[PDB]
Structures are given as structure tokens and as C-alpha cells.
Amino acid sequence: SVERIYQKKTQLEHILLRPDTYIGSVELVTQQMWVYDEDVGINYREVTFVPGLYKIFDEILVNAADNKQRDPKMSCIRVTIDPENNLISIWNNGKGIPVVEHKVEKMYVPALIFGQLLTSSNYDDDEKKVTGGRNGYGAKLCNIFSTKFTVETASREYKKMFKQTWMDNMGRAGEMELKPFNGEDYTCITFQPDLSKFKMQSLDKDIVALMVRRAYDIAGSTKDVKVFLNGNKLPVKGFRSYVDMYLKDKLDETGNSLKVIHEQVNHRWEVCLTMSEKGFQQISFVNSIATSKGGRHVDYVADQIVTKLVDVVKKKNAVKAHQVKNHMWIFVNALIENPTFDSQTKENMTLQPKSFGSTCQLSEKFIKAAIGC
Amino acid sequence: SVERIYQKKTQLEHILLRPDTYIGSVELVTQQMWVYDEDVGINYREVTFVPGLYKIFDEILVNAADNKQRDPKMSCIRVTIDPENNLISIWNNGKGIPVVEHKVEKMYVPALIFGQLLTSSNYDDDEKKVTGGRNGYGAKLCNIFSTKFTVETASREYKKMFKQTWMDNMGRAGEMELKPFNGEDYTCITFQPDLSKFKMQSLDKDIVALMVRRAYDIAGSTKDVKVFLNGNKLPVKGFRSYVDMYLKDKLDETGNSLKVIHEQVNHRWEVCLTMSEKGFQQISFVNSIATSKGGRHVDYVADQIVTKLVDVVKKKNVKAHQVKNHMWIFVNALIENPTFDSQTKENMTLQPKSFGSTCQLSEKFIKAAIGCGIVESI
Ligand SMILES: Nc1ncnc2c1ncn2[C@@H]1O[C@H](COP(=O)(O)OP(=O)(O)NP(=O)(O)O)[C@@H](O)[C@H]1O
Ligand SMILES: Nc1ncnc2c1ncn2[C@@H]1O[C@H](COP(=O)(O)OP(=O)(O)NP(=O)(O)O)[C@@H](O)[C@H]1O
Ligand SMILES: [Mg+2]
Ligand SMILES: [Mg+2]
Asked: Which residues constitute the domain of residue B210?
């Protein structure tokens, strides 16, 4: 019938029906990538996981990191991953969410921004923030892909603590709980991923290894934020220390230890460069988002290195750009104003350098070290 | 205030505020790419354009190509691009859209699927389809980024013709026009892009060259479909002839014409390979969509070539990326219910096991490839 063929879907139905552009694939994929295995540390290996599950975790984690920008006093992020009870919790301190009724939406702010699509504090680009949040989907996406999703946030400013639980893929909502509060602010998101939607039995070794490395990413990309994972503080202090976990004792194909060049250009840019034996490689972050596919921030840095190096071969000489890039392994941690991406998953940052809100001119010292690695 | 900080947006507001994940960047981009310049043909050069504009054109074009799968009797696609009057028209024959009132949505089907977000005939995946349409956004996105968007479609089956216009970024709709019909079905989408949304004054040389090459893509990726541009039939007949327009007079770094290996594995796969001297290059299509960032369909075909060529090299005295670095591959595939990273569909993510078909290059192809210059270069 005509009504069978031509269908209209609600926004909520569309997300569950076509998850890919929202949270990535909901099918099990087997591929190689960086993870953190216990008793091994950060290593590159083949893993079988569901991108979508890894992503709803990421959305909540990045939201926590975003609060450090909202309130620089924030100093900690506590993560809990419990396979047995299928429970994941992301806690952060610093200013909590305003526990008060939104005068326009007629409901308490936390319920609005965690229980309704297209809600955000990042819709006014005049503020030129360097938060990772941008579309107003992230948290609701995690909620929709969870069987139980709880939001607890305490606001001393408003003298109240808010707690409310959603269930059945954000299809049901429990009673909002309000209580007087006069303590240290905090926000804790606790959720039970709907494994049925990901066709999984439980949170296995592979997915956990991915989530743990992601926690290390956060500890390495943020500033003055201690990250705990199941009670254990992650031993990371600065982007440099994080990059070292990847290189530490790795040796060159000849035998010599890989040389690592580093420079924290300014308060918004930090770069590390080493030689690659498998073509161009990049590990990048924008506003604490893991830009796994890279983007303009990577090109911007990588290219000025390439140029310099090419301008050195012109002397000892017709080298192509890609030829030089193939021997490069670059790490970049940047803070970008109002970044744009190809999709909600934010794996590729597309904003033009002219609009970054800052520049990253590598030093002569860095270049000199680069021209001789 | 709390109300100023925490905001809720309607779906339509969100698209205009955050266009990127819907149609790509709305800012100018300068880079080299393949286009079609008149009196030159297909060529690779620096171009300055806005992806979002190029994309709304693409959405309507792929919709036309999709109809060939819906009605194999479809035979033509006619495209008109008039810079002067900022007008673009895309016409196709074959079955028209049912011109009847939708019993649930309370409006004629055409008005529903072109004027309401999240409307599609592709929401049921128990049906294994090879159309490019997937999310039910495409047509509405073009409407939204157009100052004027007209839909005309005729269905002999329902003995009716439908015509209606939308304006002001789908914010307003003119009266619906209905009339008796009993001729050859067709659908024509005519629109005037809202260039202000793309910070443009008019459809310049660069954007036109991209749109024209895109029309050539359609002529080369579809089967049994004649494509016309501004009244002229594009001289393409099969994916092979299409690829030849890129490799026509290309030469080696030494100066000899590059070797081109071709093969139509089956009714759903066609591959062309030659040598590259500027790193791995791929030009691919999935259900007539230009997968500019590639995807599993490209990995699938390229990886088996790499592994095999990687072997012939070992028995003659190597890594993987090193071999792939000298490959220029063209892939035209039909994939069942494909998934992509974004609405723009530049990267196809569906796993090979779910393609609905296989693509094993023949021995005649692998050997002919063994001597195109790749192995020798390594
Ligand atoms: N941990 C937190 N502490 C304080 N505020 C938070 C926290 N997490 C979320 N928020 C608020 O929650 C909102 C939730 O919206 P969310 O769905 O995550 O979209 P977003 O982060 O703004 N943009 P995006 O993630 O790109 O879709 C954010 O905009 C914040 O204002
Ligand atoms: N040229 C055409 N001929 C016949 N039917 C058409 C034509 N163009 C569009 N349609 C119908 O119009 C619908 C419009 O929805 P559209 O926005 O294009 O989404 P879609 O193509 O299904 N999916 P997508 O483009 O990935 O968002 C399609 O689903 C078709 O059923
Ligand atoms: Mg967020
Ligand atoms: Mg479409």
C-alpha cells in the first residue's frame, strides 16, 4: 500500500532505525586500533567491537571534559565500568547544572537537556567556546541507546540536587527527585547500555579496552584534570606523558629507538612528531574529542612541517608532498573555536585554519629537530 | 539567563544553524579536484566552491538515478543548469510518484516526501535495495537551501499530475496543482539555490564545472540511462568509457601512456586500475553515489589486488601501503542497503559480508595488472 511504502518517522524513531550517522555502526566490526589492555598498556591490535557502543560512552565522557571549560575549578573525572552489572558511570566535579525550572520549556533544566533532542548550551557561536559539544544530541543519544539512564547533578548555587532516571531507550521517564543541597557541586551520569541494540552479551574485553584507552585520552588531552577509572587514578600528566605511552620503548625498524620531537606551541596547541614505518599516521584531539580520521587541525600542523622538509630537499637536489608525509607519525592536541565535523561522531574536523581562533607556528627549534630526524 | 544559555531548537532551525552534518560545509573551500570544463573536458585543477551547494544538487540527482532501480523502464535523466537565472532542473522518466492522498499523513504523497523531514520509501530494510536513498532527508535538504523549490510529477497509474512550489527555505508553500494525466510518467525537480546561505552571488564557473562532471558520473555509473545536460546527451556508454575520460591522454612519469586494466566482474561490480605517481587514488561509486572518501567497497577490491601484487613481488627477490601507494583505482558498485558515516554519504561503511554480492577479480585481470607498472616500480 501507499502508506506502507511512503513513511514518515519521528526523530526518535529515525535514530533507532538509522543509527549510523548518529553514533556510528551498531554492527560488530573487526579491525586494528589502539586500545589499553590491562597488564599490557596502550597497544595496537585487532579488536571486535560495536562502534555505536564505544560512541555513546564517548559522548558522556566528552561532556565531562567540556565542563572543565565551563568551570576551570573542575579538577576531576571519575569513570566506572562494570561488565557484571552492565553499568557505566561518569562523574565530574566543578559547577553542576542549574537545578531550576526552565522558564520557556517549563521543566527543570537537567531534564530538558538530557531528555529532549536538540537541546544544548552550545548553540550560540558568538561565545566562541572551545567545548567539544556542538549539536545538542550527544547525551540524548546515550540515553536512547540505554535501557536505564540516570542523571544526577548538584548545584550549590541553586541549593538543590537533581536526580532523574530514564528507561527503555528514553521512551520512559521516572520521577524527578529534588533535594536541598549545600555541598561541593558534581554531575554523575550512570547508564546501562542496551546491549540488545548492539547484539552483545556483555561489556567484553575488547570494548572495555577501547573505553579505558579513551579515558587515558581524556587524561592526556585535558589540563589539570585527574582521571580515575574504577577507583584507580590514571598516571598521566600532560599531553607529552600520554604520547610517551605510545612510543616509550618502541624501536625503529633498524633497531635504533625512535626519536620524538615535542613542542607545546601555546595554550591551545601541543604537537609531537616521530617517524612512521607504515605510511602517514596521526593521533589527534580537538577540544578533547578523539578526531580519529583527522581533519584541518592535523593538515595545518603536518603541512608546515612537510613544506619545511621539502624546502630542504630542494637544496640537496622534485619530492612530492605525500612522499614526505608517508614517513610521518604526528600527535596533535588542540583547542578550536566552534569546530565543525562531517558527522555527529566527530571523527573528522573540517573547520578552516583561518577560523580556528588561534595559530600554531612550530618553533625553529622544533623544525630544526624535525629537519634532522 | 538560564533560558538564554540552555536552548532547544526545532529540527528545521537546527539544519540552518548546523548545516555541516546535513549537507557538508557551507563555507568556501579551495582545492584541486576533478571537474568538467567546456572545451577541455574532464580535468584535475584547483577549484573554489561550497560543498553544501554542490551537495543539494547531488541529492536531487541521485534521487533521479534511484528511480531506475524502482522502475527499470526508466531511460533518461535531463539536467538544466542556468547560471543567469540561478535555476537548476532535474528531470527523469520512468514511474512517477503516486499522485494520491496519503491516508495517514493527510496530504498528497509528493507534498509529503518533498515537504516534510524524515519521509522516505527506503525505511524498510527487510527489502534488499540498491538505491542510494537511505535516510529520508535529501530532497528536503535541497528544498530547505533553496529560495524556490518546485516539484512536478505525473503518474498514469493514478491518472493524475502533481505540481507544487515551496519558497523561503521550505518555510512557505504555494497552492498545489492537480490535473488529469494518462501519458508517459515523469518527475521534474526545479530549484533556485539560496546562494546567500552559501555566501555566493551566482553559480560561477567552478561550481558549474563540478555539477557538470557530476552529471557525467551519473551517466557512467548507471545502466541503460541516457543523461542530458542543457539539452545535449553526454557521450558516455558504460563505466569503462567514463574512466577513459580521465585516463584518455595520461602519461607515465617517464612519458608513456599509462596501462589501464578493466573488468566487469558481474552485474554489480566494475573495476578499473592503473598506476598512480601521487599516492593511492580512488574514484568510486555506490548505487550512483560518489563515495569521494571511499569505503569498504574500495577496500574490498583494492586490498585483494594489493595482497596479490604483494605476492608477485615477493617471488621476485614489501609492505602493504607501499604497494597501494602506486594504485589508481576506479570502482562502480551496487550495494544492498549501504550505510555511511554521514548524510553526505562520502564514505560507505557497510561490511563486505553484507554487500549482497561478491567481487573476485579474475586471473586475467590480476596478471594484466601484474604488468601495469606497479610491480616494476616497487
Ligand atoms: N557533565 C556535565 N556537567 C555540566 N553540564 C553538562 C554535563 N554534561 C552535559 N551538560 C550539559 O548537557 C548538555 C547536553 O547536551 P548534549 O546532548 O551533550 O549536547 P552538546 O554536548 O551540547 N553537543 P553534542 O554533544 O555535540 O551533541 C550540554 O550542552 C551541557 O550544557
Ligand atoms: N525523481 C524521483 N522519481 C520517483 N520518486 C522520487 C524521485 N525523487 C524522490 N522520490 C521519492 O522521494 C523520496 C524523497 O525523500 P528523500 O529526501 O530523497 O530521501 P531518500 O532519497 O529516500 N533518502 P536520502 O536521500 O538518503 O535522505 C524518496 O524516498 C523517493 O521515494
Ligand atoms: Mg555532548
Ligand atoms: Mg534521496
From this structure: 10-248
